[PDB]
Amino acid sequence: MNLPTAQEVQGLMARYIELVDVGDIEAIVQMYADDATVENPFGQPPIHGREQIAAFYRQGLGGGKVRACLTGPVRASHNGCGAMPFRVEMVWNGQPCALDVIDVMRFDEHGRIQTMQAYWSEVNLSV
Amino acid sequence: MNLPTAQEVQGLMARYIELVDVGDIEAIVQMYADDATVENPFGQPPIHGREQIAAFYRQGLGGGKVRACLTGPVRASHNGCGAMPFRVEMVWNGQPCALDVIDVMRFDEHGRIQTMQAYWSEVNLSV
Numbered sequence A, B: 001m002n003l004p005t006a007q008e009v010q011g012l013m014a015r016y017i018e019l020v021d022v023g024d025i026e027a028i029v030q031m032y033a034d035d036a037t038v039e040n041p042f043g044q045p046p047i048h049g050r051e052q053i054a055a056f057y058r059q060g061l062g063g064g065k066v067r068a069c070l071t072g073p074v075r076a077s078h079n080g081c082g083a084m085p086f087r088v089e090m091v092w093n094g095q096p097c098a099l100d101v102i103d104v105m106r107f108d109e110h111g112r113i114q115t116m117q118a119y120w121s122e123v124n125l126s127v
């Protein structure tokens, strides 16, 4: 595809959450542009490139026991960007916990994620 | 205050929604830096400065019949920024309607909104 339309952004961002929810690290990485950046949480320096991004998702999702679901609709733009609210459920030293997040994404002219910014801070974590 | 902490960002952004919900145009404008920008929706060129911002809110809220409420928690950063999901309820040619929005804000070193970006597109509008 080219620069995704608003409807395509909504589909791609929902697909991303699906891949996080099942923990398909390789499929997530494929959604990113080869030189994409991730800022997690927003406020921290970006990581760069598919290998660093793969390392990120392997760390976050490789231990298993992670689920993610949209908590409301994707809000898309007409310039290939969008924002979405979701909750990540995991386990903290064996206890269930949740993290509320908003991701902002910009897609490139091939429909790949160029930038991801994950807004959250520690008070978005609940035990 | 100085650059708001994560907790202060959560308070300021929730306060903003409160002021939108009651329609206090003057109090909203006061939350913005004198030279702030608003991008509504994200993808459109910014408006600039408190007068243009006041004109924006007078247009959006001056006709009355607008409510706004968070639909989930504010996601704040440690660098004075945050993102929040909310729903705006209004009336379209006399019929109830809703718009789902995510605002991203950056605050300045005085606790005023420097930039606001409102993510939404037409399929976030429901009649």
Ligand SMILES: O=[N+]([O-])c1ccc(O)cc1[N+](=O)[O-]
Pocket (backbone or CB within 6 Å): A020, A040, A057, A060, A061, A066, A088, A099, A101, A103, A118
């Ligand atoms: O660190 N996180 O929990 C996180 C934040 C934003 C995301 O898009 C995905 C994840 N994750 O893979 O879990």
Ligand SMILES: O=[N+]([O-])c1ccc(O)cc1[N+](=O)[O-]
Pocket (backbone or CB within 6 Å): B020, B040, B057, B060, B061, B066, B088, B099, B101, B103, B118
């Ligand atoms: O255009 N809008 O509905 C809108 C979008 C983002 C906002 O922070 C506020 C409003 N509003 O005043 O209604």
Ligand SMILES: [Mg+2]
Pocket (backbone or CB within 6 Å): A033, A034, A108
């Ligand atoms: Mg490229």
Ligand SMILES: [Mg+2]
Pocket (backbone or CB within 6 Å): B033, B034, B108
């Ligand atoms: Mg200033």
